[PDB]
Design a protein around this ligand. Structure first.
Ligand SMILES: NC(=O)c1ccc[n+]([C@@H]2O[C@H](COP(=O)([O-])OP(=O)(O)OC[C@H]3O[C@@H](n4cnc5c(N)ncnc54)[C@H](O)[C@@H]3O)[C@@H](O)[C@H]2O)c1
Ligand SMILES: NC(=O)c1ccc[n+]([C@@H]2O[C@H](COP(=O)([O-])OP(=O)(O)OC[C@H]3O[C@@H](n4cnc5c(N)ncnc54)[C@H](O)[C@@H]3O)[C@@H](O)[C@H]2O)c1
Ligand SMILES: [Cl-]
Ligand SMILES: [Cl-]
Ligand SMILES: [Cl-]
Ligand SMILES: [Cl-]
Ligand SMILES: [Cl-]
Lengths: 431, 434
């Protein structure tokens, strides 16, 4: 019937090609009349964009394509914005990981002080995107799968409460995929689940096949021995220890950072972090492939391939486009879904997705263990956004001090000072 | 593939035959190995059951059939209980309607002091059915479409919080059916809606076709001129009157029962204290169905009675099948609020959209509701909770408070006069009130 207009914010992402490839393999369920790229780093995006221009011309030359650094040109005439930006890129991620480690605190992209720092950089970036979208395409939907979703979602809830923004996380997708393999189902869409939490901080409470057969027993018996490692890395295996605290549920893998922070630090190397691995491998590999493709005018000159994993974004996009009522986990204002939890908290819960966005299902009352953990972590997140809004040093020191990943307020302060000096070019002045 | 065992509580209901004919026409989606009727009025059930037995022998002789007044015989080996009991029957309903009218207050089956009286009689009966079910078939589900659901659901929420009871109402089904004809769709299942309220006291907030097209603009235009009367005497007046009820909040569509709360003066004005709805049903439906059943028995053939399939009732099979086959079908059910309507009492029973599967309902959130509806619902839910307070605590003042608080009642003095009459008339059903 109709073809859609999509703009990818963060066109310079090393995941942009795989995603474009995935979109092309899904023109049957989600056809496009136009595809545009947007980035604030022109030179970086150009390499990714010229390579994709070749791919698109090969598999779908009928699709109108363009890339730019100009918001008006990028956000004009679009139905959807796919946002995957990394304010500060990998050089800043390296700082997020190493600074906490100098003080004996885990350094990670979205958890602990590292995540807090990334969130402080990301809030402004994402608010700008929202403002461009509303100005040039007031009816468009933004599919934000950027990080740290918990902090950024709190900011958009607070400062852009009526903006058509959908915050989604792919971590649960990956864990459900492994759970499916473990119990022997062909994919995660063969399961129906109940879940609650914050982004990167939740639990499955009910896991059944489509017929209603309870899969929890089978998963409990297996996960207790091997974690989320299917019969076919460390994070998935460690889920074994996370799940033992509450035998009746299945935990999100990111909970290892909050329940076993001593372990993460113990297995961390302050000299080489994950950002270093990506910069040494993925960053060069993808750009080298794009350079090769441009030089040849053929995609085959590159080893890029489809990111079937990212198909959940099309699930979301199509749910809205064709009002499918598909059931999926989204980050939404709680407002009674979890009855005994803060109404103004952003929570990750099951929702039906239609053309008007999500219809969250009720969750009910949650127990003291999860409630206590979530209350602590959402306060951290809300303090980070307080610090950004109010340009308050004490609000951020409070946030860091409150984190379960941080042993004391003195260590929290030492880290905060180091973080301030490193993020001078991104954070507002803190008083 | 799997066959179900059902018992109908209220076998002597004039709706039982039409419902049985409905079950028979749906053996494809809901196969039965067994069907049983239960009633506490043997002689009345016997006429209905013996007539239905002739129908089952003609259409489904494989289905095991029996009727009884024995709870053990009735509630043993069942998967579902379909409960449609009317404690006190029509003679008591006549009292519910006429006592308030004698004092210038509307008399109605489930709304106003009549509804309150019927609820006081029903709580005990339903608590008994639930206890029998749990004792003789612990794993069975009760499909309760009896009335007055708002009072009874509040009672079971407090006193049988963990029993497997699904509270459902058929009024929204009928109104949606009419809405569909009005917009021109094939049927109500071609629409997806959002709704909130108490039983017999709610509003549709969103009405779309399955593709998401807005049907509210066309409905507003039509309803503002003719109410819910489709293009195509009692109910016909109520559907037309929705015109006036809907005008208070143009952005929504109301449940027809709201006419009793927003236009109670109108209802009293168009009421006859000497002949009420109960008298109409008694002189028509009660006579006709029993005479038809009596004709089928005497002739030994279904064609001897003018019994028609109750296609409307099919919603009961939608519910039963959703549970039995984990279909995730979306429908309105009466469930504990507990945050679904965020700015409304968590312990209130609310009528809202739910997904229904084998574990029962999964309610959808509603969000915050506006002052108008919140005000009306807070008033009415307090009435309902006061009734159950009166029942539980055996308190006269609690029921006087309940009746006084009703938007159908003008004052505490009128409320007290009505209460004293209802007490005398319900001598054999109500618990004592100190
Ligand atoms: N499937 C995916 O795309 C995927 C996978 C994992 C994580 N993520 C998350 O999505 C985000 C993107 O990470 P990545 O590794 O996919 O991309 P990346 O780190 O390879 O590149 C990020 C791009 O965003 C651009 N950018 C930064 N700030 C911007 C702004 N204000 N406006 C416009 N563009 C801006 C940068 O110039 C850069 O080209 C991260 O937060 C990450 O946690 C996405
Ligand atoms: N059956 C339907 O589809 C339908 C339609 C509209 C309304 N209702 C509602 O359902 C209820 C039944 O109404 P009706 O007109 O269908 O029935 P009815 O008045 O025709 O018959 C009611 C039956 O329930 C029996 N009964 C009363 N108390 C009982 C008890 N404690 N245990 C067992 N049986 C008992 C009576 O003896 C009688 O046989 C009412 O509350 C009514 O508002 C049902
Ligand atoms: Cl707030
Ligand atoms: Cl390599
Ligand atoms: Cl909605
Ligand atoms: Cl600021
Ligand atoms: Cl909807």
């Amino acid at each position: 019937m109709k073809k859609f207009s999509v703009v990818i914010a963060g066109g310079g992402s090393t995941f942009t090609p795989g995603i474009v490839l995935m979109l092309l393999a899904n023109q049957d369920r989600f056809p496009l009349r136009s595809l545009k790229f947007y980035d604030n780093d022109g030179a970086r995006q150009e390499t990714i964009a010229e390579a994709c221009k070749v791919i698109l011309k090969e598999q779908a030359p009928e699709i109108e394509f363009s890339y730019t650094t100009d918001p008006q040109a990028a956000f004009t005439d679009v139905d959807f914005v796919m946002a995957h930006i990394r304010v500060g890129k990998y050089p800043m991620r390296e700082q997020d990981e190493k600074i906490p480690l100098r003080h004996g605190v885990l350094g990670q992209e979205t958890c602990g002080p590292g995540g807090i720092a990334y969130g402080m950089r990301s809030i402004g970036g994402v608010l700008e995107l929202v403002d461009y979208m509303e100005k040039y395409s007031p009816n468009a939907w933004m599919l934000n799968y950027s990080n740290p979703a918990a902090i950024v979602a709190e900011a958009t809830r607070r400062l852009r409460p009526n903006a058509k923004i959908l915050n989604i996380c792919d971590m649960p997708i990956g864990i459900e995929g492994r759970m499916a393999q473990i119990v022997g189902l062909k994919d995660r869409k063969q399961m129906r689940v109940r879940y609650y939490g914050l982004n990167h901080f939740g639990w499955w409470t009910s896991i059944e096949d489509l017929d209603g057969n309870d899969l929890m027993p089978k998963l409990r018996e297996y996960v207790a021995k091997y974690g989320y490692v299917p019969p076919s890395n460390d994070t998935f295996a460690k889920a074994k220890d996370v799940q033992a605290l509450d035998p009746q549920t299945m935990p999100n893998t990111y909970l290892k950072y909050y329940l076993f922070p001593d372990y993460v630090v113990a297995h961390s190397n302050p000299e080489r972090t994950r950002a270093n691995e990506v910069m040494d491998h993925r960053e060069k590999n993808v750009f080298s492939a794009c350079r090769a493709i441009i030089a040849a005018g053929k995609s085959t000159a590159g080893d890029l391939e489809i990111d079937e994993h990212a198909s959940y974004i099309v699930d979301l996009a199509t749910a809205i486009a064709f009002n499918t009522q598909e059931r999926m986990l989204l980050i939404v204002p709680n407002n009674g879904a979890i009855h005994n939890f803060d109404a103004d908290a952003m929570v990750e819960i099951p929702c039906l997705v239609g053309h008007n966005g999500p219809e969250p299902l009720t969750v009910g009352d949650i127990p003291h263990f999860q409630k206590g953990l979530m209350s602590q972590q959402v306060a951290v997140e809300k303090l980070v956004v307080d610090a950004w809004e109010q340009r308050s040093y004490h609000k951020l020191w409070q946030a860091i001090t409150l984190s379960k990943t941080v042993p004391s307020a003195s260590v929290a302060k030492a880290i905060l000072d180091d973080l301030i000096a490193a993020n001078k070019d991104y954070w507002p002045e803190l008083h």
